[model samples]
Target: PVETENIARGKQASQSSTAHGGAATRAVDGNVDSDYGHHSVTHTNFEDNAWWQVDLGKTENVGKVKLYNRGDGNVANRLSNFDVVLLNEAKQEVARQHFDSLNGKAELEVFFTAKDARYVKVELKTKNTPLSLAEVEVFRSA
Candidate 1:
């Protein structure tokens, strides 16, 4: 059996806003360090519908998305109530998963059937909150 590969690593990543030296590229830099102090987290300013996305460069069959939340308990709660959205080349949403909470967990895995998508987006549904992620990994089964 072949293993899945993390296709989002080193891909083009962007977020709605950047703060605290947390650039969007940090999430896709192939680092899983969940601590913001480690400088591996991507953070957005407090705003409505804060989002972070990675472009795969082309359409590919994606099986799952693994999100690493900031490990700090004080700010980890901002990761709650988010959505994982899969979009095609034209930016039309093809699949989505709604997560009500992180439940104090550092890692979140969202699974979906293999779907053709060029972009993977993680958006916070709550208002007036920042979106922070230590890492975002998109896997494609072999």
Candidate 2:
């Protein structure tokens, strides 16, 4: 999923409140760049919520988080408003899922077969007709 309307998607530019969970090792850049356009935000009134944080770049026991979105960035009908959370080490916010999108590639596959979770915070609470700006691609194998 790599749409490129030259980079442009609704609401959600950059955010990383806190991410420093650990265990072993990992690394994945492109941490929401798109020249700051992937969060173009177009909301008539559905701007529910938005968040995207990850540091799986160095941590173990992450189950899954391979999300992607693009309402205008050309990421082919993009979206991944996965207000999903699984924070450990005291952050305490276990498995949570609330996704709803169809004609915008809201390719989501949230699972925690056993995400004793290291540090992951993905949000986009709701969407459909208020704003759309998403792009996330991550996977784990263990």
Candidate 3:
């Protein structure tokens, strides 16, 4: 299990939405159940440029992130080829990398060079499907 000291814990989350199901807060709710409705999961209503982001309140040396894949739904495969981006207070991208396809309830772990960022964003970067997540976690090294 990942540690509970996530830098993204309780941060304000926002996303391009459709008012359908789980809201952006689900992404950082610390519940990685992967079950869509029961445990709450992030889902963007079908739309282009779908994205979900969290405000970390202050810039830090961000180094790692974990994206828990939705456990159910035929559309779960849509959580693929997205971009995990880190940005500074100015909203200028500081570091970014393309994440691998989330195959199922599988969680993805990503590590990057420590970068200064106050915001962490996950944006759709492929034509596969809508953006979805069971949980989004961020970690910083002191």
Candidate 4:
């Protein structure tokens, strides 16, 4: 097995909306603090298909994506029912994984087939739900 580096740190990040001081860049800030008060979370306004994306700056072989969910028991379930999507430089979907729920878990790791991608997106599938992520890490196999 090869070692992997988190390619997403400090990269350009954007999301549908920002709320409660949860800026889009916080997800890739290299901090895994799950507490919202710690100010290391990304949050979007409640809406249909809320999304957050990171641009890798260039295409790379992506193997896995790790997400840190909100650890607060009160709002942890808000991170449920989402999709992890990999996109090429053209913004075409290269790969995707559907998660039924975060199940109040604090972390999740989704494995891909080592696809070439320049953008990674995490989107909520359900309507009227805000998307929140404590941290998002994209890995490239070394």
Alpha-carbon runs more than 4 Å astray in model 2: 1-53, 56-68, 77-104, 120-142
Backbone clashes in each candidate structure, one number apiece?
0, 18, 0, 0
Alpha carbon lDDT of each predicted model: 0.91, 0.43, 0.82, 0.89
TM-score of 1: 0.95
Candidate 1 lDDT over residue span 72-131, tens digit each: 758889998899999999999999999999898889888878789999999999999999
Instruction: Give per-residue CA lDDT, model 3, range 1-142, as digits (tens).
Output: 2334798877999998745677899888878888786847887777777899999999987878888888876677788778999999999999889866765548888786868899999998765356778888998864
Candidate 4 has an lDDT of 0.89
Which number leads on TM-score? 1
Query: What's every prediction's RMSD, in angstroms?
Result: 1.4, 15.5, 2.4, 1.2
10 residues in a row with least lDDT, candidate 2: 18-27
The local lDDT score (0 to 100) that residue 99 gets in candidate 2 is 68
- List model 4 lDDT by residue over 1-142, tens digit each: 2246788999999999887778999999999999888989888888899999999999998888999998764988877788999999999999999998867568998988878999999999889988889899998855
lDDT of 1 at 127: 96
Clashing residue pairs for model 3: none
Residue 2 in candidate 3 has what lDDT? 33
Steric clash pairs (candidate 4): none
Sliding window of 10 residues with minimal summed lDDT for model 3: 1-10
In candidate 4, residue 54 scores what lDDT?
98
Tens-digit lDDT track of model 2 for 42-126: 2223344535554443444555665544434354332444466767656677667766554543455566665665556656555
